[PDB]
Design an enzyme around this catalytic site. Structure first.
Site, PDB file in Angstrom:
ATOM      1  N   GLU A   1       0.986   3.754   2.044  1.00  0.00           N
ATOM      2  CA  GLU A   1       1.541   4.082   3.355  1.00  0.00           C
ATOM      3  C   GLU A   1       2.715   3.172   3.702  1.00  0.00           C
ATOM      4  O   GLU A   1       3.754   3.637   4.186  1.00  0.00           O
ATOM      5  CB  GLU A   1       0.445   3.987   4.418  1.00  0.00           C
TER       6      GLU A   1
ATOM      7  N   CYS B   1      -2.050  -0.586   7.269  1.00  0.00           N
ATOM      8  CA  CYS B   1      -1.211   0.602   7.164  1.00  0.00           C
ATOM      9  C   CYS B   1      -1.215   1.405   8.454  1.00  0.00           C
ATOM     10  O   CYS B   1      -0.197   1.995   8.824  1.00  0.00           O
ATOM     11  CB  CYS B   1      -1.682   1.480   6.012  1.00  0.00           C
TER      12      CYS B   1
ATOM     13  N   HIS C   1       0.835  -1.188   0.000  1.00  0.00           N
ATOM     14  CA  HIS C   1       0.000   0.000   0.000  1.00  0.00           C
ATOM     15  C   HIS C   1       0.879   1.249   0.000  1.00  0.00           C
ATOM     16  O   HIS C   1       2.077   1.197   0.292  1.00  0.00           O
ATOM     17  CB  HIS C   1      -0.918   0.003   1.220  1.00  0.00           C
TER      18      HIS C   1
ATOM     19  N   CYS D   1      -5.701   1.992   6.002  1.00  0.00           N
ATOM     20  CA  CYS D   1      -6.378   0.758   6.344  1.00  0.00           C
ATOM     21  C   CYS D   1      -5.825   0.208   7.659  1.00  0.00           C
ATOM     22  O   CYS D   1      -4.879   0.760   8.224  1.00  0.00           O
ATOM     23  CB  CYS D   1      -6.218  -0.243   5.200  1.00  0.00           C
TER      24      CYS D   1
END
Ligand SMILES: O=c1[nH]c(=O)c2ncn([C@@H]3O[C@H](CO)[C@@H](O)[C@H]3O)c2[nH]1
Ligand SMILES: O=c1[nH]c(=O)c2ncn([C@@H]3O[C@H](CO)[C@@H](O)[C@H]3O)c2[nH]1
Ligand SMILES: [Zn+2]
Ligand SMILES: [Zn+2]
Lengths: 157, 157
Positions: B54, B85, B52, B82
Site C-alpha cells: 500500500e 498502511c 508495504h 495494516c
C-alpha cells in the site's frame, strides 16, 4: 542522553522547515549512543505523503544498517508519531520511542486531528508493548514550542 | 471493476513473492478505472520495512500525478491494510479502499497480529472518513487463497 537526541530531533524539525523539505517534524534513530539516521519531514521535497520524519528516519537507518529490523536502536521524535508513523515504528522493531511534543501541539496550528490509538493505548485490535517515553520539563517545552515558532514558515499538508 | 482491480492487486502479490521482492501483498491505485499505480510489497527488495504494498503504491501514485494528495483516487489492497498502511491511506486522502482478505489470513501464515482499529471501526483517536469495502464471494476467495498458495515461498518479515 535523551535530552541530546530529542534536541537533535527538534533542530532537524527546524532545519527541514527552513529548507522547505516539509513540516516541522524531526526524527533521530540511534544505536547505543551512535546516531544511525537524522531526518526531518520530506513530504514536500519528495512529493510523498508517507515521507514523515519518522518514516524517513526508518528508511535511512535500515538502508544504512542493511537490515529491515532496528531492534537494537531507539527513535527520538520531535513530536508524537502519527498512526502511520507509529505503525512504521512497530514494523521496524525499534525497541524504544522518545517523543517531545504531544500531537495536540501540532493540531493547534492546523494539522490533522490524527492520533495513534496504539500509542495512547486506546485500541481494541492494535496493542503495543513498545517502550514509550513522553519527555517532560526542558526538552519537552522546547519541543512543544516548535509549532508556534514555525507556523508561518511552511505550507500545511 | 472492483473485481478486476482487486484481482490485479492479488496478481501483484503473487508476482512480488515470485521475484523475491517481499511478501504476498499487492496494491493498485486507480483514478476513474485508469490504473495510476500497481505495486507489491518491496520490504525485502528495498531493505525497507515501510515498503508495504500500500505504501509503495501510494508513493508511486503520488509521483506519477506529481502531488501529495490522491483525493480522486481509490486503492485496492489484496489484504486488509495494516495500521501503518491505513494511516498512510488516511494521509493520502484516497477516497475509497477496497480490500480482499482479512488480516487474519496473513496472521494465520506467520505475520504479526497487527490490525488497524480505525479500519474496523474501533478507533478512538484515529477516525477515518474514507469509504471501505471488504470484498465478498470470488474476490474474497482469491485474496484468502493468496496466503495458502504462497506458504513457505517467501521469507517472513
Ligand atoms: O508523525 C508524524 N511525522 C511527520 O513528519 C508529520 N508531519 C505532519 N504530521 C501530522 O501532524 C499531526 C500530529 O501527528 C498529524 O495530523 C500528522 O499527520 C506528522 N506526523
Ligand atoms: O498492509 C500491509 N501491506 C503489506 O505489504 C504487508 N506485508 C506484511 N504485512 C503484515 O500482514 C499482517 C496483516 O496486515 C500484519 O502483520 C502486517 O504487518 C503487511 N500489511
Ligand atoms: Zn507520521
Ligand atoms: Zn501495511
Amino acid at each position: 542522553s535523551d535530552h541530546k537526541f530529542l534536541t537533535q530531533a527538534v533542530e532537524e524539525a527546524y532545519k527541514g522547515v527552513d529548507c522547505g523539505d516539509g513540516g516541522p517534524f524531526g526524527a533521530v534513530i540511534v544505536h547505543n549512543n551512535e546516531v544511525v539516521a537524522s531526518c526531518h519531514n520530506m513530504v514536500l521535497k519528495y512529493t510523498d505523503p508517507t515521507a514523515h520524519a519518522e518514516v524517513t528516519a526508518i528508511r535511512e537507518a535500515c538502508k544504512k544498517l542493511n537490515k529491515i529490523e532496528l531492534s537494537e536502536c531507539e527513535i527520538y521524535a520531535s513530536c508524537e508519531p502519527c498512526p502511520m508513523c507509529f505503525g512504521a515504528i512497530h514494523l521496524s522493531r525499534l525497541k524504544r520511542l522518545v517523543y517531545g511534543a504531544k500531537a495536540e501541539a501540532a493540531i493547534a496550528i492546523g494539522f490533522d486531528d490524527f492520533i495513534a490509538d496504539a500509542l495512547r493505548g486506546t485500541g481494541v485490535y492494535q496493542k503495543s508493548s513498545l517502550e514509550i517515553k513522553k519527555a517532560d520539563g526542558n526538552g519537552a517545552a522546547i519541543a512543544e514550542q516548535v509549532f508556534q515558532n514555525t507556523k508561518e514558515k511552511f505550507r500545511l499538508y
